[PDB]
């Protein structure tokens, strides 16, 4: 599924990402935009053999288990397939654990390069929430 900008903002708010651990909602919508372009089925194989899954491109080496990545740690205790659903529940649950580390949202490279330091609130503006 490919979410609309406002559609995802409303969904993420419903999934408790408005002000989760100091991060305003716009951060998450922006991250999704640049990580997967709002596509829940997005996948990207990395050189180290790991793969990034879902709307928030969660990595298989540290966060989810796809059973095909070397030193997998499965920090989110979840199968990567669950992060490819049109239902964002699992991706949000795992993203919350990820951001609860001292590195915060810096775990998302696209967010760091295209969102951090920008007017992220703009990503939820003009939306019925």
């Amino acid at each position, epitope marked *: 599924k490919v979410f609309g900008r406002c559609e995802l903002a409303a969904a993420m*708010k*419903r*999934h*408790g*990402l*408005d*002000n*989760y*651990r*100091g991060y305003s909602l716009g951060n998450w919508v922006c991250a999704a935009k640049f990580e997967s372009n709002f596509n829940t089925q997005a996948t990207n194989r990395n050189t180290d053999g790991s793969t990034d899954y879902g709307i928030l491109q969660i990595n298989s080496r*540290w966060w989810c288990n796809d059973g095909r990545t070397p030193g997998s*740690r*499965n*920090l989110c*205790n979840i199968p990567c397939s669950a992060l490819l659903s049109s239902d964002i*529940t699992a991706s949000v*649950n795992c993203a*919350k*654990k990820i951001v*609860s*580390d*001292g*590195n915060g949202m810096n775990a998302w490279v696209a967010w760091r390069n295209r969102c951090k330091g920008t007017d992220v609130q703009a990503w939820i503006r003009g939306c019925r929430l």
Partner: antibody
Amino acid sequence: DVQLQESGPSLVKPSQTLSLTCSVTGDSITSDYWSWIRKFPGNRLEYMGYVSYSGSTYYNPSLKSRISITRDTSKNQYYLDLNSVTTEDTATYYCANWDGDYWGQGTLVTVSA
Amino acid sequence: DIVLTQSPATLSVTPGNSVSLSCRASQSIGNNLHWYQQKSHESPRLLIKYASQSISGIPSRFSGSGSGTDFTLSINSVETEDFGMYFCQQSNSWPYTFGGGTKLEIK
């Protein structure tokens, strides 16, 4: 599967450092976030803090920076140190993973002169 | 810190009857409210995560609902094994905090 278990002295003196150990069995400590929670005499639970995969720690301000949570990969254990304890630190201490799915059995530590 | 207030402090019920437990937050916490059960001589047990998400291995009679500042834990047809303490905990902001707990007893 995963098993957690607390160990350490059950009796300590005021002003000393209280130290507990949580031994993890079933998987590496490097594969999760680890926490410490305690229960005071009147069914009052307090989340003490946790250490995440990067080594970063989060401590409850209520502890006024007297707490330290560390890990030892080789022994697959993590620890809790609480400095300058007082009778107000008497409680049942539990270790548990960040998700809350795995908990230790808990251990009562009494601070008395 | 975010303050969680639970009510009633105590609730007596007859097995077979249903009950609902309340937990309200001092500020909005989205869906970041979890429910724990704790019996004497035992460690807490996670029953519901993120306000309404089910937990594998927990009886289906337990359900959660709510968002923002008001949450509830419902037990459809209480069983003797359900008597004990119930605590809500928020993970929206650090430090995580717990409600004061609600004691469920046989009337």
